[PDB]
Amino acid sequence: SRSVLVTGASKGIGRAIARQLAADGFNIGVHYHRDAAGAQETLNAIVANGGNGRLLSFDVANREQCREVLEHEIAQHGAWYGVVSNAGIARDAAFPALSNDDWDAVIHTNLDSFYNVIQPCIMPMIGARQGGRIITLSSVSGVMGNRGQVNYSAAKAGIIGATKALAIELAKRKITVNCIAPGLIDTMEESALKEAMSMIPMKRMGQAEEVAGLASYLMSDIAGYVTRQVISINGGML
Amino acid sequence: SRSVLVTGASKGIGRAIARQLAADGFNIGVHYHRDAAGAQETLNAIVANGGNGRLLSFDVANREQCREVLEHEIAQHGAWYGVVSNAGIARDAAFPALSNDDWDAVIHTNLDSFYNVIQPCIMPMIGARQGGRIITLSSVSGVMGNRGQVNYSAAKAGIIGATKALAIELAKRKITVNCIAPGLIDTGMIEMEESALKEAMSMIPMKRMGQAEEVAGLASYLMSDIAGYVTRQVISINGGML
Amino acid sequence: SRSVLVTGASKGIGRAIARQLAADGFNIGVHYHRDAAGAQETLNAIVANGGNGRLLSFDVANREQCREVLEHEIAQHGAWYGVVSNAGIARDAAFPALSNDDWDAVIHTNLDSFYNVIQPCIMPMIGARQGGRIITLSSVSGVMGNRGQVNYSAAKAGIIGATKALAIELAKRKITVNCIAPGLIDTGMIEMEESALKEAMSMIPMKRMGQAEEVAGLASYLMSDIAGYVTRQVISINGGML
Amino acid sequence: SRSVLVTGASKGIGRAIARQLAADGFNIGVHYHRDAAGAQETLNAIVANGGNGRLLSFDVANREQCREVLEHEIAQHGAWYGVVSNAGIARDAAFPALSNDDWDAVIHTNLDSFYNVIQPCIMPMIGARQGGRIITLSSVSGVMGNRGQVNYSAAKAGIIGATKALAIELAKRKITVNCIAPGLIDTGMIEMEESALKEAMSMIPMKRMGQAEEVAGLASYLMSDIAGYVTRQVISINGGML
Numbered sequence A: 001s002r003s004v005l006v007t008g009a010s011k012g013i014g015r016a017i018a019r020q021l022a023a024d025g026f027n028i029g030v031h032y033h034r035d036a037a038g039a040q041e042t043l044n045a046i047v048a049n050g051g052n053g054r055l056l057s058f059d060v061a062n063r064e065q066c067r068e069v070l071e072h073e074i075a076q077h078g079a080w081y082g083v084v085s086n087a088g089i090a091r092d093a094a095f096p097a098l099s100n101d102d103w104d105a106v107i108h109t110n111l112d113s114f115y116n117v118i119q120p121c122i123m124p125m126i127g128a129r130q131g132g133r134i135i136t137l138s139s140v141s142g143v144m145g146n147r148g149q150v151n152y153s154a155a156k157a158g159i160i161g162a163t164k165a166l167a168i169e170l171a172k173r174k175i176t177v178n179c180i181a182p183g184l185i186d187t188m189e190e191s192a193l194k195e196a197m198s199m200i201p202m203k204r205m206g207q208a209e210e211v212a213g214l215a216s217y218l219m220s221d222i223a224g225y226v227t228r229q230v231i232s233i234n235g236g237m238l
Numbered sequence B, C, D: 001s002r003s004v005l006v007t008g009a010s011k012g013i014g015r016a017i018a019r020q021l022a023a024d025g026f027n028i029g030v031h032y033h034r035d036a037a038g039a040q041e042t043l044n045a046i047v048a049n050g051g052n053g054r055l056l057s058f059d060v061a062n063r064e065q066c067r068e069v070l071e072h073e074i075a076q077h078g079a080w081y082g083v084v085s086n087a088g089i090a091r092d093a094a095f096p097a098l099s100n101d102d103w104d105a106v107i108h109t110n111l112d113s114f115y116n117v118i119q120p121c122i123m124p125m126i127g128a129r130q131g132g133r134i135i136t137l138s139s140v141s142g143v144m145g146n147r148g149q150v151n152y153s154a155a156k157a158g159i160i161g162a163t164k165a166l167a168i169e170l171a172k173r174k175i176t177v178n179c180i181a182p183g184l185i186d187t188g189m190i191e192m193e194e195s196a197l198k199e200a201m202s203m204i205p206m207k208r209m210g211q212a213e214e215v216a217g218l219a220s221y222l223m224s225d226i227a228g229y230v231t232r233q234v235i236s237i238n239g240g241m242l
């Protein structure tokens, strides 16, 4: 079998992705930060529906903890086949009012996590010679920019550049590297929500299960020639 | 059941897409232009593997013929749920050496086909109230441009713009409209001297061509019910070219 | 000196581009289709301000007339240094209501013009060994798609693909090929009910239309000697739409 | 009487941009990090050619120093009209071999500098009511990714997203915010073995590096009054790479 780490699997998109990939037959690393209950609830649903997984935990902003836990997991269970770097946060404010923490927490958590979580998985993935899948979670605001979120937009755009650069390095190793950029998904400021809606031709939010379908496609064996892409799932926003 | 028209289903990507969507449980309009044998061979494989379809035929550059055949098909069998506008051609030459026929055949066939094939399907799709799927075939050269193919690049980029504009009009009708942009795929369309193949590979990080079945997997994803929030997208399947 | 053909110079963006490039010191081919008065007015302002130009005329949808007039002009005056393929039209309607003429007039005029106008200018440009500039006019709707204009979006996206492909062919010849994609610009082309204008503005962060002179400033930059490393680009001038 | 801060003005692109904008008549904040001599050399050339500027210094990765120096400069001289956030570095290595410092130094310097340098300038720019210009330096590798530079690609892409988001916030304040993405430019930053240079050229249709002055011409255009409708753009100057 083939295992896939899913960060932020305790809720929302991460939970949905974990469920779907488990159903597809992947053994899931159900990761959480602090919500261990949510994580167990996710794993319970996975087991109930006939699939396999296990809990693990770390702060994606904590480089050393990430390396510790992942090296241990890999030693005990073998290399991951897939990594879904889904975990992330927002700390919105107009650019001039943005606090040091607002900026740093978003950059360290959303962008540094690429290095912190994915780096420890790469050589083992290569060593196992099964090929692989890497999927990152960006955002429409990473693609187009969004008022009130210069920090989030920056981090999410940075994830896109990281994803593309890595895709080139790992192509010859049969590891695809792609990024999913959701629009507004049902999991902020009522003012900003209204503006966001003004731009969705489909006039609805997406569901987490929809994002998971795309992840499923990208994880699948038939998607091995798709790499270096940002694929947006956003109701037509752009 | 739900039917999907697939143009250029007599070979290559169209054939592969037809096969895959049939396996997914769609009833396939296996379209061809002149290669009726190829079309039947595609339908035979569909039936052999437990699915349904039927042949139909038209020149996608021929507006009247497209409207005649499609109106007839729709009257007899009901609205298409899906349309995969896959058919296309190339007539390569450096821009200054490009003949009138080289330009017109590529624009009329690859770009005018959007209007000719898809227009007659829209109101019926809307009328049936099942929602829908529209998928066009562009190309990496439509996204980035490609030397020796100003005509192909133009037509294929034009398909992208058409697709996006239509996606906006039909979003509130639960019809998604997306475009697949393959890179280099191993079919009869590509005929390359070993020298030019080597150079082409130098630009593909995966150092291989794609297979038609791979393109079909993406079409399958886009056709699926879970992909109903994906619209207005160009999705590239190209081994990392860009 | 160096001459630049500007199509659709009888009004709007073309007129503004003609004026600006004349001021920059280029000798302007002030082209028009039917509005000869507008064209002469444009040339009068050019001469009044101490620059040079001359009138010429053709239907950019008429391949033969384009080739005839351009070959003649080139024989008499030498190769163009620059070509600004600016002329274009819109025939909007929802996709299912779009007439044959709506589709064809837009594709033939906006997209076929690339071939019809620019092809005859290429070998001579190369032959003259001065390098060169080619600038096409697309649109924000060619980049993103726009509801009510599947035809315009298609043509304008096709111009982008053509531009990019050509840019690659001509890079070694010191001829840059770029595309300008304006957003909403205040000209006769735009006729909008106050209700629709308000909505349009809601999507422009700068809450105003652009002026033709603004589009001309970008053309001016791209035409300039310092812009010789910029090629294969679509540059949008749209008040922040995207 | 309009001043523009140019970070990394002690050499390369920053030097070239400083020179050009000085010639355009802007009063230049010639910033440096450690190379004070280079910075003075830049200012000497500015003064020699009839323009104005002054030196200032800070580590763009040092938030508190940036705020201290910039608040002081703004108190003494008034708000900047323009900010060109040009300074940056690379620490290349294959992703699995990338050290903590390789990653952090590039993210902190190239991406955190957006916040560190530009935030202190914004309210004052708004308060002065002259409108304004913000220009950031990304890179082709920020747009497409580049092997050996996951860190640089990430930072440079992040600059793009920052730029675009800020452009939306400041549009109504008549401050444009754009990003320049150069391809390969001939400076001290590029240090390449002849073998790797040849390969790099294979991917540039113009088969040459750009010059810093070329990047400066584009900055000049964006700084100009006629470019007030251009905002939220990434404009690539790369010899046709993409």
Ligand SMILES: NC(=O)c1ccc[n+]([C@@H]2O[C@H](COP(=O)([O-])OP(=O)(O)OC[C@H]3O[C@@H](n4cnc5c(N)ncnc54)[C@H](OP(=O)(O)O)[C@@H]3O)[C@@H](O)[C@H]2O)c1
Binding pocket: A007, A008, A009, A010, A011, A012, A013, A014, A032, A033, A034, A035, A036, A038, A058, A059, A060, A061, A086, A087, A088, A089, A109, A137, A138, A139, A140, A181, A182, A183, A184, A185, A186, A187
């Ligand atoms: N919702 C949208 O509209 C939308 C749109 C575009 C992109 N996205 C992106 O998609 C991803 C998921 O979105 P979502 O709506 O599912 O978010 P969500 O429901 O708020 O869940 C966020 C997850 O991230 C985890 N997390 C927070 N801080 C962390 C840290 N320091 N280390 C590790 N994990 C941490 C949380 O952990 P615990 O709760 O387990 O402690 C939680 O599982 C995010 O990266 C988001 O930026 C969302």
Ligand SMILES: NC(=O)c1ccc[n+]([C@@H]2O[C@H](COP(=O)([O-])OP(=O)(O)OC[C@H]3O[C@@H](n4cnc5c(N)ncnc54)[C@H](OP(=O)(O)O)[C@@H]3O)[C@@H](O)[C@H]2O)c1
Binding pocket: B007, B008, B009, B010, B011, B012, B013, B014, B032, B033, B034, B035, B036, B038, B058, B059, B060, B061, B086, B087, B088, B089, B109, B137, B138, B139, B140, B181, B182, B183, B184, B185, B186, B187, B188, B189, B190
């Ligand atoms: N192969 C690639 O590398 C590649 C890359 C990017 C995009 N694409 C695109 O993918 C699509 C399929 O290409 P392919 O490689 O599968 O090509 P192919 O094997 O040459 O298939 C061509 C198909 O298009 C049909 N066709 C051609 N002219 C037609 C007309 N005037 N009216 C109706 N149908 C017509 C053909 O019908 P008959 O055989 O019955 O004559 C045939 O089924 C094309 O649009 C192409 O531009 C291909």
Ligand SMILES: NC(=O)c1ccc[n+]([C@@H]2O[C@H](COP(=O)([O-])OP(=O)(O)OC[C@H]3O[C@@H](n4cnc5c(N)ncnc54)[C@H](OP(=O)(O)O)[C@@H]3O)[C@@H](O)[C@H]2O)c1
Binding pocket: C007, C008, C009, C010, C011, C012, C013, C014, C032, C033, C034, C035, C036, C038, C058, C059, C060, C061, C086, C087, C088, C089, C109, C137, C138, C139, C140, C181, C182, C183, C184, C185, C186, C187, C188, C189, C190
């Ligand atoms: N205005 C906008 O909001 C906007 C936005 C994005 C893009 N654009 C593009 O900008 C370019 C110029 O726009 P504009 O607003 O200045 O247009 P305009 O004022 O409506 O002028 C149209 C120009 O194109 C010429 N023309 C029209 N049909 C022609 C044909 N068949 N053959 C030759 N010439 C023809 C006209 O010649 P006569 O005067 O001789 O008839 C006229 O000079 C167009 O390509 C347009 O698509 C405009």
Ligand SMILES: NC(=O)c1ccc[n+]([C@@H]2O[C@H](COP(=O)([O-])OP(=O)(O)OC[C@H]3O[C@@H](n4cnc5c(N)ncnc54)[C@H](OP(=O)(O)O)[C@@H]3O)[C@@H](O)[C@H]2O)c1
Binding pocket: D007, D008, D009, D010, D011, D012, D013, D014, D031, D032, D033, D034, D035, D036, D038, D058, D059, D060, D061, D086, D087, D088, D089, D109, D137, D138, D139, D140, D181, D182, D183, D184, D185, D186, D187, D188, D189, D190
């Ligand atoms: N060269 C290229 O091919 C290329 C291509 C794409 C993008 N770019 C981007 O263009 C910009 C300029 O590049 P360039 O090639 O001119 O680079 P360069 O010759 O290496 O010049 C670098 C400048 O950035 C400054 N700098 C570096 N670290 C700093 C810090 N911590 N705080 C403040 N200033 C710092 C340097 O200051 P001191 O010398 O005074 O220490 C110097 O003035 C960079 O952002 C670069 O990434 C360059």
